[PDB]
Design an enzyme around this catalytic site. Structure first.
Site, PDB file in Angstrom:
ATOM      1  N   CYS A  87       4.035   9.659   0.431  1.00 43.22           N
ATOM      2  CA  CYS A  87       3.916   8.625   1.504  1.00 43.22           C
ATOM      3  C   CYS A  87       3.860   9.281   2.897  1.00 43.22           C
ATOM      4  O   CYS A  87       3.355   8.659   3.831  1.00 43.22           O
ATOM      5  CB  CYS A  87       5.069   7.622   1.389  1.00 43.22           C
ATOM      6  SG  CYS A  87       5.493   7.254  -0.341  1.00 43.22           S
ATOM      7  N   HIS A 348       0.369  -0.517   1.526  1.00 45.47           N
ATOM      8  CA  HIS A 348       0.824   0.889   1.545  1.00 45.47           C
ATOM      9  C   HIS A 348      -0.198   1.765   0.822  1.00 45.47           C
ATOM     10  O   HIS A 348       0.007   2.101  -0.342  1.00 45.47           O
ATOM     11  CB  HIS A 348       2.223   0.969   0.932  1.00 45.47           C
ATOM     12  CG  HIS A 348       2.814   2.334   0.939  1.00 45.47           C
ATOM     13  ND1 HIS A 348       2.424   3.324   1.839  1.00 45.47           N
ATOM     14  CD2 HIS A 348       3.776   2.881   0.169  1.00 45.47           C
ATOM     15  CE1 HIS A 348       3.126   4.412   1.613  1.00 45.47           C
ATOM     16  NE2 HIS A 348       3.981   4.158   0.612  1.00 45.47           N
ATOM     17  N   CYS A 378       9.633   7.258   4.835  1.00 45.39           N
ATOM     18  CA  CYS A 378      10.204   7.878   3.618  1.00 45.39           C
ATOM     19  C   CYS A 378       9.055   8.153   2.666  1.00 45.39           C
ATOM     20  O   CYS A 378       7.980   7.582   2.844  1.00 45.39           O
ATOM     21  CB  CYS A 378      11.259   6.998   2.950  1.00 45.39           C
ATOM     22  SG  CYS A 378      10.661   5.399   2.352  1.00 45.39           S
ATOM     23  N   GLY A 380       8.123   9.369  -1.635  1.00 45.70           N
ATOM     24  CA  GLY A 380       8.586   9.600  -3.008  1.00 45.70           C
ATOM     25  C   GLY A 380       8.937  11.048  -3.169  1.00 45.70           C
ATOM     26  O   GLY A 380       8.273  11.862  -2.517  1.00 45.70           O
TER      27      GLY A 380
HETATM   28  C1  COA Z   1       5.095  -4.506  -6.985  1.00 51.75           C
HETATM   29  C2  COA Z   1       3.788  -4.205  -7.730  1.00 51.75           C
HETATM   30  C3  COA Z   1       4.069  -3.746  -9.175  1.00 51.75           C
HETATM   31  C4  COA Z   1       2.980  -5.488  -7.776  1.00 51.75           C
HETATM   32  O1  COA Z   1       1.761  -5.218  -8.506  1.00 51.75           O
HETATM   33  P1  COA Z   1       0.859  -6.463  -8.933  1.00 51.75           P
HETATM   34  O2  COA Z   1       1.525  -7.181 -10.059  1.00 51.75           O
HETATM   35  O3  COA Z   1      -0.555  -6.028  -9.110  1.00 51.75           O
HETATM   36  O4  COA Z   1       0.981  -7.347  -7.602  1.00 51.75           O
HETATM   37  P2  COA Z   1       0.208  -8.708  -7.273  1.00 51.75           P
HETATM   38  O5  COA Z   1       0.214  -8.959  -5.802  1.00 51.75           O
HETATM   39  O6  COA Z   1      -1.115  -8.681  -7.964  1.00 51.75           O
HETATM   40  O7  COA Z   1       1.120  -9.766  -8.069  1.00 51.75           O
HETATM   41  C5  COA Z   1       2.289 -10.393  -7.542  1.00 51.75           C
HETATM   42  C6  COA Z   1       2.244 -11.886  -7.771  1.00 51.75           C
HETATM   43  O8  COA Z   1       3.103 -12.488  -6.773  1.00 51.75           O
HETATM   44  C7  COA Z   1       2.334 -13.211  -5.840  1.00 51.75           C
HETATM   45  N1  COA Z   1       2.754 -12.796  -4.524  1.00 51.75           N
HETATM   46  C8  COA Z   1       2.868 -11.509  -4.069  1.00 51.75           C
HETATM   47  N2  COA Z   1       3.235 -11.455  -2.810  1.00 51.75           N
HETATM   48  C9  COA Z   1       3.374 -12.785  -2.427  1.00 51.75           C
HETATM   49  C10 COA Z   1       3.732 -13.390  -1.210  1.00 51.75           C
HETATM   50  N3  COA Z   1       4.035 -12.697  -0.121  1.00 51.75           N
HETATM   51  N4  COA Z   1       3.765 -14.748  -1.164  1.00 51.75           N
HETATM   52  C11 COA Z   1       3.449 -15.432  -2.274  1.00 51.75           C
HETATM   53  N5  COA Z   1       3.085 -14.969  -3.471  1.00 51.75           N
HETATM   54  C12 COA Z   1       3.073 -13.622  -3.479  1.00 51.75           C
HETATM   55  C13 COA Z   1       0.865 -12.883  -6.108  1.00 51.75           C
HETATM   56  O9  COA Z   1       0.018 -13.942  -5.718  1.00 51.75           O
HETATM   57  C14 COA Z   1       0.898 -12.601  -7.611  1.00 51.75           C
HETATM   58  O10 COA Z   1       0.884 -13.845  -8.337  1.00 51.75           O
HETATM   59  P3  COA Z   1      -0.462 -14.181  -9.205  1.00 51.75           P
HETATM   60  O11 COA Z   1      -0.460 -13.302 -10.474  1.00 51.75           O
HETATM   61  O12 COA Z   1      -0.365 -15.673  -9.530  1.00 51.75           O
HETATM   62  O13 COA Z   1      -1.642 -13.866  -8.278  1.00 51.75           O
HETATM   63  C15 COA Z   1       2.989  -3.114  -7.005  1.00 51.75           C
HETATM   64  O14 COA Z   1       2.429  -3.617  -5.797  1.00 51.75           O
HETATM   65  C16 COA Z   1       3.830  -1.905  -6.695  1.00 51.75           C
HETATM   66  O15 COA Z   1       4.165  -1.159  -7.610  1.00 51.75           O
HETATM   67  N6  COA Z   1       4.204  -1.741  -5.425  1.00 51.75           N
HETATM   68  C17 COA Z   1       5.021  -0.628  -4.973  1.00 51.75           C
HETATM   69  C18 COA Z   1       4.183   0.473  -4.393  1.00 51.75           C
HETATM   70  C19 COA Z   1       4.996   1.681  -3.993  1.00 51.75           C
HETATM   71  O16 COA Z   1       6.163   1.806  -4.364  1.00 51.75           O
HETATM   72  N7  COA Z   1       4.374   2.605  -3.251  1.00 51.75           N
HETATM   73  C20 COA Z   1       4.981   3.874  -2.865  1.00 51.75           C
HETATM   74  C21 COA Z   1       4.936   4.917  -3.965  1.00 51.75           C
HETATM   75  S1  COA Z   1       5.565   6.543  -3.464  1.00 51.75           S
END
Ligand code: COA
Ligand code: COA
Ligand code: COA
Ligand code: COA
Lengths: 392, 394, 392, 394
Positions: A87, A348, A378, A380
């Site tokens: 990151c 991100h 920060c 990973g």
């Molecule tokens: C958290 C994580 C697993 C989510 O992946 P994902 O399942 O593809 O995420 P999505 O946004 O597609 O899905 C989340 C769901 O919640 C909903 N949602 C997400 N944010 C929302 C918000 N702010 N308000 C309302 N609904 C929300 C989405 O619409 C989706 O629902 P759906 O399936 O009906 O569309 C992924 O983003 C992740 O791993 N993030 C962390 C990244 C990280 O740690 N980076 C640094 C690495 S060193």
């Protein structure tokens, strides 16, 4: 031995498999680099070095920084390195540029970062020397090289939840920060506060007219506390971290043009900002979410400044929990934090985020009439990096 | 003033699928780093930064430099970055350490590189969003990220042969340089001239005692000009580049400990070597094999210095053709070039080779009674990097 | 409506990744088919149908039976089907041929089976429409289509152990049968009792001289009760099934030439054997190891013969436990069972095994001066097939 | 004497990646088999054998016919085999059932076929024993086992165009037959002529109510000669075969219940149809598209019968070109051919199509007041299979 920033440009941030899905990371980096050189009024041929961050390098081809430099129109004669500090990659590129310029070895560096998590491949371990028999796995390179600890295999999101739990940061506090991050990003966009920093992306089309991406894809005008409270824990059913209070997987590019203070003076250039100082700290992998407040405290100690001397902060929203925790650890007024939104709303794109938050910090500072900013991030593996900049 | 090198260590270099097959790149890095800290008599917890090169990062996991650092016993509290400048990665790690120490931001850095081309994965592009229908490619990540031009898709070995053709370097000159490289590496091993720089690799067995790898695997005692002339061109029927006058794919790590002059004097530490200066140049991807002689020329120009003041040269043998071309372009005495062998005999573990040639150069200087050396390395993408070092005994 | 067998030929059986690793299943089938036509003195052009078993069809190409027919020199004008009844495939091809000939629709059929478990590919489910994110599996097609139940996912070897446990068949009894299977296979080979049925495989070489495979690879002269007792349970640490008392993954081909009794009479052909009758039974997937004794009992009831009317038996050694259990269920003298060895020693090339045991049964019968034989074979998914043949 | 068909049922045919995307081949088979048993008023536990066709068996799991049988509620105690005769699989399943019943070995068989070309996997050849180095292929199993010649690697669609070229069948004749196929399929759907043969597929949703697929997905209401003439040749710039005058890749199942004449009379059961005779021929792989007319001619020769005694024909539309060629070779009145549409409009789920065309033929005969029909199908590898059936009402 002082470094000025002549310019700072970023692409919009795209969602996973969304608006920038068909643009390679190196093309996103090239677009940012070219906009930064135009905005600096610096000829591409005068660049002395390109230092570019990217984390998921597998399948990008030979030295991605060179591909981004060439995509920008920077000539073959300019030297380049690709850097990986997860990151922090995009920020470390900038602080490395500051260090090189402070030696006098070079006086004009392009630094930044890029990521296309949409375009990361899948891998096969075992296929080279042969599986022989039994099922094996096809591994998401985002998960293997970006989102999971190389030591434990644990997802960054599990460590985020464990720290939120140990720091006593409620589900409700995290959803409030997520909401605030969305509302500030949509507001900044509507009121034109991202217009100056963004370079649009033009995507040649199978159709006739090209697609122009000019807006950050991930901010939601329609998100609410009610909708966020409905979402399920994503990494552990007992934890508080959800898709709504954690940033996504994203695509983006960010670039800055750095020059020696002395050369900028002599050329009669008015710098956008000055780099006052930077520092990094390191902790065990599982404590990575704690580092931004520690890094800020380490930088204040280094500069002899106090938190009250700082006009604005960008702390990368690795989780909403991390903005909240780092606020407590450094005693930051949240009204001066991520004022135009942050990664929970904006995404991100790992390798770009470090440079992206500096681009955002500079323009947020320009918008309130200048001052002193710290960007802290920060990463990973358990590192934290912070930089202090001045916009006069 | 000048950054000092307290110590320099490398693993043996293994063949592709060979003696270090079962060791990860990060383990090879850790072994080299730990041996460097032992030989420097530096405590692992005093290191302030680890800068480590590796090229085929795909599937190594989060920030490979940090994995190498932890494998060496370096504590969690030490900062690290991984760098990639293809074949120059291990060398640019050292010159970046030099620049950082020269700013005063740090006074003690570990720098070097690592690669395990044996353990590189295959990739699937298109499986994420779906093939839909029709056959696709399963891609060798060494080929995709290491051995082919990001711009043209052309193998580095095609560029090697094209530059050898354009410079008028014959098949016979290339094979003579290859035979010489093997003779010098075999000779350096048998006469004990690698014993000081090499840290052996101990591979714990499921079965009986550990396997200890202490010898470079690629050098051939039994190669001859005759056998080399029999080999067929690898990348083009009409080119002069073979498996015998080109380096292999290889496994290895190499590490150096760097310290400020001032800190070295406070602690009573005699430098193994001093970094005098370094420079880098860049050309078109296809011209990468021509850069080492140009990097040397620019480094001499920069230091006011003359080719005659340099006692030894390490020019990474990206091809035999590259050692010959670079000799003419810099006007080098071949008797002062790669005197213990180079990559054609010893192998090219891409991310490590730039640190490796500095380790070999320091020990070849020390064997010669001391002197000035230049390490120069070309890299895929069209870059050349050269570093000038000074070695004195007592 | 009676079927004679003019000829019966098999390739040696190769170990997994061993002597036949570089021969395609269709090439092993072609070699068997060609040797059967030569031994029958039947012109390839007179064949009316080819019915060929193979189980792991994925990646063999269009209609594998046709590839084997063409590899044999059978002309394009001859019709063919590929059949899949898992372990029974090779036997069901023969009993289907018997049925077709008994209708009069055809009078001269080639039937058999082939498998190259060495050459089975790996598969990717999910790659077509896309994984999107997260790790997935690369699946061993031997495991997915041959060795695991389509309903439960359980390995055949787990069902083998569960039946051995429920039937009260000790580890020691299974290792004794394995030893006896090895000793009878090595003995048969040394004393020339496989010389007549085997067609050697010639493998063109990168070197100058071709490799000739003339011997079954898997029999071990040096195996002992002591070595077998040392081996560990392979599928469950509480069970009795090991690598030593279960057959391997193997490569092989087997073919027979079938003709109407009436046509063979008129052509003045002396048949090798006559098909008296056949039957099949089906049970739940997990009970597949029980079927061979049931199938034998069903065939005795069908023919009105008693166990004492049968001179020799071939029960495919799906596990050593299956030879022992099926011996009890049908009350078979083990001195008349698998007398030249069986699959524990010789291997189980799934699609060929059903035809292979008939080839072995015919020659074992010829060697003791003729008589009546039953070949019986269980098959994954819970079927059992048995055929009664006469050698005069 | 003659085997009787008590019942005949098929799923709708789905487009590739379309309406039946989420349904396995074995489920499509089970749905067809269950509807056949319901319509025959036969108890699932009375079935003595299931013979089911499927072509892309890779990744379907152990003996797919048994999975289809169990999906239909047929008990564990019923024997089964899976058959593969590429495009003829579903039809050869029926003619094998006919032969078995004619021996007396069984008196009640379920026969038919199934395919889900949507759900076919990709394969990796070489990953078992290792690539070592260099890029390889990730192979579409529809292409490897279904759509390409085992001998030449040539796509069936190249062979289709080559035979259309050699027979002198124009692009314009092919597109007119394609337009006709769509018009007849759309017309049969809208006028209720598919309602009796189709068993709808109910797909349980994670979300709300189940999705019920009751209509063939591929027939286009809005296709025209104009639009068909605009399409580009798919397999060769110089050939006449397009996506519009060639069938697609498709998902479907089809099943029939067969019984001995004697058993049918004992149980009081009126036959839906009788199997009169069947034959198969075989030619070179490249000549597969010519076989349907030859199969019809050999079947007529065999039955002493004349082309004029046949009221309806189903010739699987392997290409539009194949329906036209086969019409000339057998001297067929086109008004008696594929009268409710064929594969160009309706799709070609390879393993099911041979059973599917018999189901469509039985119901087209019944709509016509009864008569004699021939179903003929060519298959990859160079085979043709034809079956003669008789349908009387009351
Ligand atoms: C958290 C994580 C697993 C989510 O992946 P994902 O399942 O593809 O995420 P999505 O946004 O597609 O899905 C989340 C769901 O919640 C909903 N949602 C997400 N944010 C929302 C918000 N702010 N308000 C309302 N609904 C929300 C989405 O619409 C989706 O629902 P759906 O399936 O009906 O569309 C992924 O983003 C992740 O791993 N993030 C962390 C990244 C990280 O740690 N980076 C640094 C690495 S060193
Ligand atoms: C050249 C290259 C394709 C060779 O790969 P390879 O075929 O696996 O090579 P091998 O080591 O197996 O050698 C091939 C044959 O040549 C023979 N050979 C190689 N060097 C020999 C020598 N010095 N004397 C005699 N025979 C020799 C080997 O014994 C082998 O014979 P064999 O196959 O009968 O055993 C590969 O090493 C390569 O691409 N190297 C380039 C590295 C590079 O460009 N890196 C930098 C890029 S940024
Ligand atoms: C049992 C099974 C998993 C073994 O696979 P494997 O591990 O590759 O088997 P191997 O023979 O390579 O390994 C067994 C080990 O026991 C040893 N061994 C096996 N049989 C032995 C014998 N008779 N005497 C002594 N040692 C023996 C081998 O030497 C080997 O030891 P090693 O690793 O030191 O060489 C596999 O053969 C299998 O699944 N068989 C069942 C097939 C089946 O059910 N088919 C029908 C499907 S419908
Ligand atoms: C011919 C084939 C390659 C086409 O595959 P495809 O490209 O996925 O086909 P699609 O259905 O997507 O059609 C391609 C285009 O033609 C158009 N098209 C197809 N039929 C049309 C029609 N009747 N009217 C108008 N347009 C039509 C489609 O709308 C589509 O346009 P779009 O891409 O703009 O949406 C493939 O179906 C095939 O190989 N079929 C042969 C089957 C076979 O040989 N099986 C037996 C082998 S043993």
């Amino acid at each position: 031995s002082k470094t000025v920033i002549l310019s700072a440009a970023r692409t919009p941030v795209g969602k996973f498999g969304g608006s920038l899905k068909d643009v390679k990371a190196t093309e996103l980096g090239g677009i940012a680099i070219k906009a930064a050189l135009e905005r600096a009024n610096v000829a591409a041929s005068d660049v002395e070095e390109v230092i570019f961050g990217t984390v998921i390098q597998g399948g990008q081809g030979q030295i991605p920084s060179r591909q981004a430099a060439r995509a920008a129109g920077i000539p073959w004669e300019v030297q380049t390195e690709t850097v990986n500090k997860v990151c922090a990659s995009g920020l470390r590129a900038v602080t490395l540029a500051d260090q090189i310029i402070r030696t006098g070895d070079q006086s004009l560096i392009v630094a930044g970062g890029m990521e296309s998590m949409s375009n990361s491949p899948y891998i096969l371990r075992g296929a080279r020397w042969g599986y022989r028999m039994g099922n094996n796995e096809v591994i998401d390179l985002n998960v293997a090289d970006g989102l999971t600890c190389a030591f434990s295999g644990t997802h960054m999101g599990v460590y985020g939840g464990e720290v939120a739990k140990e720091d006593g940061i409620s589900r409700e506090a995290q959803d409030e920060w997520a909401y605030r991050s969305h509302q500030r990003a949509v507001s900044a966009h509507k009121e034109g506060r991202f217009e100056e920093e963004i370079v649009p992306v033009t995507i040649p089309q199978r159709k006739g007219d090209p697609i122009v991406v000019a807006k950050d894809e991930a901010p939601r005008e329609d998100t609410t506390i009610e909708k966020l409270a409905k979402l399920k824990p994503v990494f552990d059913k007992t934890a508080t971290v959800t898709a709504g209070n954690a940033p996504g997987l994203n695509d983006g590019g960010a670039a800055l043009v750095l020059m020696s203070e002395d050369r900028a003076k002599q050329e009669g250039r008015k710098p956008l900002a000055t780099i006052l100082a930077h520092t990094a700290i390191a902790v065990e992998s599982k404590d990575f979410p704690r580092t931004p407040g520690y890094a800020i405290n380490a930088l204040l100690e280094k500069t002899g400044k106090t938190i009250e001397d700082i006009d604005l902060f960008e702390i990368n929203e690795a989780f909403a929990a991390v903005a909240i925790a780092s606020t407590e650890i450094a005693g930051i007024d949240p009204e001066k934090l991520n004022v135009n939104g942050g990664a929970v709303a904006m995404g991100h794109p790992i390798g770009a985020s470090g440079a992206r938050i500096i681009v955002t910090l500079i323009h947020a500072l320009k918008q309130r009439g200048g001052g002193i900013g710290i960007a802290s991030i920060c990463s990973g593996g358990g590192q934290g990096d912070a930089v202090m900049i001045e916009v006069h």
